[PDB]
Design goal:
This protein has 820 residues and is an alpha+beta fold. Helices cover 35% and strands 20% of the residues. The protein is built from 26 helices and 32 strands. Strands 7, 8, 9, 10, 11, 12 and 13 form a seven-stranded mixed sheet that branches. Helix 2 (50-68) links the parallel strand 1 and strand 2. The chain is globular. The chain starts with 6 loop residues before the first helix and ends with a strand. Bound molecules: magnesium ion (2 copies). Residues 611, 681, 683-684 line the site of one magnesium ion (MG). It binds one RNA strand of 79 nucleotides through helix 7, strand 28, helix 19, helix 20 and helix 21. It is found in: Cytoplasm.
Length: 820
RNA sequence: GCCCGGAUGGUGGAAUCGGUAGACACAAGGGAUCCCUCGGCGUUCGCGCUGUGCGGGUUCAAGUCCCGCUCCGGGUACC
């Protein structure tokens, strides 16, 4: 062995072994239990950030641990490669988006390798390649024929392609119930986003108006509180009035260049229950796109109605009682909560549910109302007027009929050799590209490209069979691996990507491509990486943000930054730990850290400093501790193997000291296993390993037996540490002369017999307060425990002239003397 | 507003089952890369008092469980 740990001498050698042996490449093997461990695929922006490194370290820890458990593990990697940032960059550089992207892919890929992430590289995908995106093109045309795709003019205002996600709203909603291993926060977020609403539509007569007006409400129980109606600016009635109302016309237009504003239509509606005439306004807070584009305003009870009403001097009216039985104070604001009705005629004293239903029945029966479900979820807009994305496989024939691009004209290849006049898509500015021909007779092909959410909605499934032509998926491959066992990414994608891929999975199931309802069993959302942030105020009053690496802090009595400076000698203020930014200038580059300390150090810190799902505060000094630890592990292994082979261990003959140490070894194995496998508290896992290593370094290494126990302990630690720091462990495994490559060594299992105790610790309380800890035989009787607790001066002096009233005893744990 | 966390040393945090609080690490500081000290106050060095945001409550026993309070963090809404 070499005396120095030198990651530079070890990491690339091990990495190259992994490529040469294709260690992490896997097939669909039915004799083994599968495990699919998936991290969210990176966008090739140019270089990895600390988010990626934390995300992929977590995945890799799991993937490696699961392999050592004897499972067949898929850990795939890929590139979500279309998108906007390349178009602006092709521009700011000489280049085109494709070559820029491929350059970025190559560079980041080399970074992922230097971190020793054990991916199956034979499954690598880059989504901007025809070999990938042809398949979403083919699937689009299929979805079209299914009745799930349509074209529509709509606001953002332009013609767009939509996929009908609303057709699966109730499945997307109900199936949240099957996802116990998704975090609540994410689930709630998809509920809210779907926004399933049970309500009542209520139609009014209007006075000098030859139609009726319908509103949608979720609170029909408050109907008697309705003092006016609000209609969206795009409402037919508001546009009607606006012909003879110059001021209204102004408003139907000020609602584009975008807190309450409105204009009176002049129209009076007739409330159906009261006969009372009420005013219709156009209001800026009424969505034309949801419900009916109009509301019954109840300002006593909805906050937006309240603010609109008191700003335009409209009647506010209380109709729901206070929580406590009393009439409510509406002087400040709307009273929001459901409660008992008053001020509502025949409906007085009814509570929310009984009232909802009484007032709906009555209105249904007068023929001016009906129950109604609405959804906040709108259909998914998939077209972009952008160049860098998959072309949309649709065609307009010269006669005017739209249809899918024919199967023999697929894939519709987007061309990569282009010049950017960076403001028109090269496939738009040249009028030849659009030109094509179907069945003879000329045709114009679509020029919009896919929303980039389109590639990231199905990649996880394509990883199962990435080289399969003949189909989007190989169903036997896909069904072997799916569903994903753990999916690891940020919580920010909750109602975008996390929703699209569930929807797409069900799309693929319904085309007979997969046989399961949901794509992923567990979602783990890893916290943010934060760094320290500093700034000085310049002569001009402007805040200049200084990188904490450039910061020079000065502690105090006890640690505590009391004053800091940069090299220019500016006075810095410390704002704490915060999200990493360009604004705040506090980004840490993982490449610098990987090259400073080695990857194992960087990984070990990332996994140690904080639980997967809590924020992680980057510290250089914590990183350096992780580095020093690896050196202490290296040293111990070196001093040990320097002495050569060991005799076989003899378990029956060990000292009480030797037995205690061996028991710490196997208890650690048990705790580390539980913490990684079941709890997923990787930081406490690592802490147990360190705790154990501190004890090992202090143990004797001279006798045949001491040395054999060390051999065992080291072989166990090196495996336990391997999912976090594979390069150093792979190496030390060899040095210790373990069987084969560490990547296929079995996860250590704790030996039940080694964990048995001969003695135990019993805490003695006197009236509930500790006064001693005693070591008694493991099987001492209660009487023996009381007698020995008594012999302890530390106890016996809280038993002087005072008498034991009763005693509480938990076998082998606690004796509580109640006194006295 | 709403949902969701959290509060324990100088800092980051542990404590799963109510029963040895503060593991592990950093920051120290100090001593000839490591062994050590390290919650606060006092010490005769064995401990003693005190202590997990503030009020209660249950319990022989609360960081842990229940009821208020006060604070902090991060998401999010004219649906
Ligand atoms: Mg934890
Ligand atoms: Mg406990």
């Amino acid at each position: 062995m070499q005396e120095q740990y030198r990651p530079e001498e070890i990491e690339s050698k091990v990495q190259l072994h992994w490529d040469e042996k294709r260690t992490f490449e896997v097939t669909e093997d039915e004799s083994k239990e599968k495990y699919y461990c998936l991290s969210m695929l990176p966008y090739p922006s140019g270089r990895l950030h600390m988010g990626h490194v934390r995300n992929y370290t977590i995945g890799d820890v799991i993937a490696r641990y699961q392999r050592m458990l004897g499972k067949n593990v898929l850990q795939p990697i890929g590139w979500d490669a279309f998108g906007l940032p390349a178009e602006g960059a092709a521009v700011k550089n000489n280049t085109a988006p494709a070559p820029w992207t491929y350059d970025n892919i190559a560079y980041m890929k080399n970074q992922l390798k230097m971190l020793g992430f054990g991916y199956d590289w034979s499954r690598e995908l880059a989504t901007c390649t025809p070999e990938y995106y042809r398949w979403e093109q083919k699937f689009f045309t299929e979805l079209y024929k299914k009745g799930l795709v349509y074209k529509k003019t709509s606001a953002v205002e332009i013609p767009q392609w939509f996929i009908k996600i609303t057709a699966y709203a109730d499945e997307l909603l109900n199936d949240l119930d099957k996802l116990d291993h998704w975090p609540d926060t994410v689930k709630t977020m998809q509920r809210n986003w779907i926004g399933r609403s049970e309500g009542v539509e209520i139609t009014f007569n209007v006075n000098d108006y030859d139609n009726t007006l319908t509103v949608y409400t979720t609170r029909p129980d408050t109907f008697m509180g309705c003092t006016y109606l609000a209609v969206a600016a795009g409402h037919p009635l508001a546009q009607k009035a606006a012909e003879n109302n110059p001021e209204l016309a102004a408003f139907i237009d000020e609602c584009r260049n975008t807190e309450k504003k409105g204009v009176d239509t002049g129209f009076k509606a007739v409330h159906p229950l009261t006969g009372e005439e009420i005013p219709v306004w156009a209001a800026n807070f009424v969505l034309m796109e949801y419900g009916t584009g109009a509301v019954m305003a109840v300002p006593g009870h909805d906050q937006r109605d309240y603010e609109f009403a008191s700003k335009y001097g409209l009647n506010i009216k209380p109709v729901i009682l206070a929580a406590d039985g009393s009439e409510p104070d509406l002087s400040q604001q709307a009273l929001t909560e459901k409660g008992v009705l008053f001020n509502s005629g025949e409906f007085n004293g009814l509570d929310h549910e009984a009232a909802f239903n009484a007032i709906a029945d009555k209105l249904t029966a007068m023929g001016v109302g009906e129950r109604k479900v609405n959804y906040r979820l709108r259909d998914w807009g998939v077209s972009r007027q952008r160049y860098w994305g998959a072309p949309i496989p649709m065609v307009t024939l010269e006669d005017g009929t739209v249809m899918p691009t024919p199967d023999d004209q697929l894939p519709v290849i987007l061309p990569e050799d282009v010049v950017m006049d960076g403001i028109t898509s090269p496939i738009k500015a040249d009028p030849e590209w659009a030109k094509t021909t179907v069945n003879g007779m000329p045709a114009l092909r679509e020029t919009d490209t896919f929303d980039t959410f389109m590639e990231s909605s199905w990649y996880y499934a394509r990883y199962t069979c990435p080289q399969y032509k003949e189909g989007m998926l190989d169903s036997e491959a896909a069904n072997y691996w799916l569903p994903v066992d753990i999916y690891i990414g940020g919580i920010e994608h909750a109602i975008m990507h996390l929703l699209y891929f569930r929807f797409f999975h069900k799309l693929m199931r319904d085309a007979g491509m997969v046989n399961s309802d949901e794509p992923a069993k567990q979602l783990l959302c890893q916290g943010m990486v934060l760094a320290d942030a500093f700034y000085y105020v310049g002569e001009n009053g402007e805040r200049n943000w200084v990188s904490p690496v450039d910061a020079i802090v000065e502690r105090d009595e006890k640690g505590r930054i009391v004053k800091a400076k940069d090299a220019a000698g500016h006075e810095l203020v410390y704002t704490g730990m915060s999200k990493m930014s360009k604004s705040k200038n506090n980004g840490i580059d993982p490449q610098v850290m990987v090259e400073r300390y080695g990857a194992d150090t960087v990984r070990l810190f990332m996994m140690f400093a904080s639980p997967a799902d809590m924020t992680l505060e980057w510290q250089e000094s914590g990183v350096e501790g992780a580095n020093r630890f690896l050196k202490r592990v290296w040293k111990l292994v070196y001093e040990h193997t320097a002495k050569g082979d060991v005799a076989a261990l003899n378990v029956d003959a060990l000292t009480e000291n030797q037995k205690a140490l061996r028991r710490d070894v196997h208890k650690t194995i048990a705790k580390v296993t539980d913490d990684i496998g079941r709890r997923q508290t990787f930081n406490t896992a690592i802490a147990a390993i360190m705790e154990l290593m501190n004890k090992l370094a202090k143990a004797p290494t001279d006798g045949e037996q001491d040395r054999a126990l060390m051999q065992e302990a080291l072989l166990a630690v090196v495996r336990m540490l391997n999912p976090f720091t594979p390069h150093i462990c792979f190496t030390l495994w060899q040095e210790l002369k373990g069987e084969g490559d560490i990547d296929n060594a079995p996860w250590p299992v704790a030996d039940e017999k080694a964990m048995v105790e001969d003695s135990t610790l019993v805490v003695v309380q006197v009236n509930g307060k500790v006064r001693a800890k005693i070591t008694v035989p493991v099987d001492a009787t209660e009487e023996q425990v009381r007698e020995r607790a008594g012999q302890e001066h530390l106890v016996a002096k809280y038993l002087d002239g005072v008498t034991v009233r009763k005693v509480i005893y938990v076998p082998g744990k606690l004796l509580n003397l109640v006194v006295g």
